[PDB]
Enzyme design. Structure first.
Site, PDB file in Angstrom:
ATOM      1  CG  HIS A  19      35.551  12.680  28.325  1.00  0.00           C
ATOM      2  ND1 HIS A  19      36.227  11.862  27.446  1.00  0.00           N
ATOM      3  CD2 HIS A  19      35.651  13.936  27.826  1.00  0.00           C
ATOM      4  CE1 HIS A  19      36.713  12.589  26.457  1.00  0.00           C
ATOM      5  NE2 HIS A  19      36.377  13.851  26.663  1.00  0.00           N
TER       6      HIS A  19
ATOM      7  CG  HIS B 182      33.442  13.992  37.609  1.00  0.00           C
ATOM      8  ND1 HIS B 182      34.148  15.052  38.133  1.00  0.00           N
ATOM      9  CD2 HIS B 182      34.323  12.972  37.493  1.00  0.00           C
ATOM     10  CE1 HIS B 182      35.402  14.685  38.336  1.00  0.00           C
ATOM     11  NE2 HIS B 182      35.534  13.426  37.957  1.00  0.00           N
TER      12      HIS B 182
ATOM     13  CG  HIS C 222      35.840   8.458  37.271  1.00  0.00           C
ATOM     14  ND1 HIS C 222      36.447   8.824  36.088  1.00  0.00           N
ATOM     15  CD2 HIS C 222      35.988   9.509  38.111  1.00  0.00           C
ATOM     16  CE1 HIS C 222      36.940  10.044  36.209  1.00  0.00           C
ATOM     17  NE2 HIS C 222      36.674  10.482  37.427  1.00  0.00           N
TER      18      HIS C 222
ATOM     19  CD  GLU D 298      39.304   7.879  37.600  1.00  0.00           C
ATOM     20  OE1 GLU D 298      39.413   8.947  38.233  1.00  0.00           O
ATOM     21  OE2 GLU D 298      39.497   7.781  36.368  1.00  0.00           O
TER      22      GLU D 298
ATOM     23  CG  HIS E  65      36.547  11.864  41.426  1.00  0.00           C
ATOM     24  ND1 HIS E  65      37.242  11.504  40.289  1.00  0.00           N
ATOM     25  CD2 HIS E  65      36.887  10.961  42.377  1.00  0.00           C
ATOM     26  CE1 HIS E  65      37.967  10.430  40.542  1.00  0.00           C
ATOM     27  NE2 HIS E  65      37.770  10.081  41.800  1.00  0.00           N
TER      28      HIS E  65
ATOM     29  CB  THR F 192      41.864  10.592  37.257  1.00  0.00           C
ATOM     30  OG1 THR F 192      40.490  10.949  37.089  1.00  0.00           O
ATOM     31  CG2 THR F 192      42.224  10.613  38.734  1.00  0.00           C
TER      32      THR F 192
HETATM   33  C1  LIG Z   1      43.627  23.252  32.597  1.00  0.00           C
HETATM   34  C2  LIG Z   1      42.181  23.133  32.225  1.00  0.00           C
HETATM   35  C3  LIG Z   1      41.609  21.743  32.358  1.00  0.00           C
HETATM   36  C4  LIG Z   1      41.015  21.440  33.706  1.00  0.00           C
HETATM   37  C5  LIG Z   1      40.103  20.238  33.697  1.00  0.00           C
HETATM   38  C6  LIG Z   1      39.685  19.793  35.066  1.00  0.00           C
HETATM   39  C7  LIG Z   1      38.828  18.553  35.080  1.00  0.00           C
HETATM   40  C8  LIG Z   1      38.493  18.087  36.479  1.00  0.00           C
HETATM   41  C9  LIG Z   1      37.648  16.822  36.558  1.00  0.00           C
HETATM   42  C10 LIG Z   1      38.389  15.532  36.259  1.00  0.00           C
HETATM   43  O1  LIG Z   1      39.480  15.401  37.224  1.00  0.00           O
HETATM   44  S1  LIG Z   1      39.373  14.359  38.407  1.00  0.00           S
HETATM   45  N1  LIG Z   1      38.850  12.997  37.808  1.00  0.00           N
HETATM   46  O2  LIG Z   1      38.431  14.875  39.334  1.00  0.00           O
HETATM   47  O3  LIG Z   1      40.715  14.175  38.832  1.00  0.00           O
HETATM   48 ZN   LIG Z   2      37.117  12.223  38.356  1.00  0.00          ZN
END
Ligand SMILES: CCCCCCCCCCOS(N)(=O)=O
Ligand SMILES: [Zn+2]
Ligand SMILES: [Cl-]
Length: 258
Positions: free
Chosen positions: A62, A92, A94, A104, A117, A196
């Site tokens: 992703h 990471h 986007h 985003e 992020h 997100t």
């Molecule tokens: C509950 C287990 C799943 C947790 C996954 C966390 C992914 C975090 C990275 C993606 O999120 S973001 N785009 O920073 O909002």
């Molecule tokens: Zn993110």
């Protein structure tokens, strides 16, 4: 039929497996600068990445994650709207297929070329897993990327992408200093939101910096050479891996600056 960013598994499909997609505090959101209000109760934001220790970089199908060793009190975010200390676990990006899209969050509907992020978890909960079961378990520092001058501190990330082109691939990535990805100003907007990407958990305090960092066209073009697919599969370039703005609902965006 795993979630993704395509026509049949993209953002508009996520709610079926993850009903919270239509929740009360979903992210990202459009930041209406004129409606955002300066908040005097906000304490000074503190980003202390001096002792940050990266370990590996991974293409998860992703995006790509630059992971950090979060077993010790290092690389922490505190202050601002945050109560307590949040520890950096990974960062990471986007991005889009074109410079005109990719971020985003949007600012007065403006879409930036990409968005960084930096993910942190509230240490009061012990670890990341337990933190994502709490309304204030995470804090994500978001930084916009625009195309112009190159960002020297990003090059080491760019040059290692060739080794993790496809889904599932990882590579050692030690001694990377995230301080080199931060803009000059720490002025920001903040609001309660969610992850997100699925599972879209509503555990995030979002801190989005107003000042974008500049990256070169060449640097982002290399982001676009990555693959969503795994090795030996038809190539589908990893581009436009962003979720669009979601309803603000019963929320207010606060500004750290007057
Ligand atoms: C509950 C287990 C799943 C947790 C996954 C966390 C992914 C975090 C990275 C993606 O999120 S973001 N785009 O920073 O909002
Ligand atoms: Zn993110
Ligand atoms: Cl496609």
């Amino acid at each position: 039929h795993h979630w993704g960013y395509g026509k049949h598994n993209g953002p508009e499909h996520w709610h079926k497996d993850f009903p919270i997609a239509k929740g009360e505090r979903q992210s990202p959101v459009d930041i209406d600068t004129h409606t955002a209000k300066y908040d005097p109760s906000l304490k000074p934001l503190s980003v202390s990445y001096d002792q940050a220790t990266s370990l590996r970089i991974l293409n998860n199908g992703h995006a790509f994650n630059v992971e950090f060793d979060d077993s010790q009190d290092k690389a922490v975010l505190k202050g601002g709207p945050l109560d307590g200390t949040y520890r950096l676990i990974q960062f990471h990006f986007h991005w889009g297929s074109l410079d005109g899209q990719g971020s985003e969050h949007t600012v007065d509907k403006k879409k930036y070329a990409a968005e960084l992020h930096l993910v942190h978890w509230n240490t009061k909960y012990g670890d990341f897993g337990k933190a994502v079961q709490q309304p204030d378990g995470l804090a994500v520092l978001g930084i916009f990327l625009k195309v112009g001058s190159a960002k020297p501190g990003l090059q080491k990330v760019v040059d290692v992408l060739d080794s993790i082109k496809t889904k599932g691939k990882s590579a050692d990535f030690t001694n990377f200093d995230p301080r080199g990805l931060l803009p000059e100003s720490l002025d920001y907007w903040t609001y309660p939101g969610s992850l997100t990407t699925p599972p879209l958990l509503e555990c995030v305090t979002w801190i989005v910096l107003k000042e974008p960092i500049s990256v070169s066209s060449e640097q982002v073009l290399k982001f676009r050479k990555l693959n969503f697919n795994g090795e030996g599969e038809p190539e589908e370039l990893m581009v436009d891996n962003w979720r669009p703005a979601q309803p603000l609902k019963n929320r207010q965006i606060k500004a750290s600056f007057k």
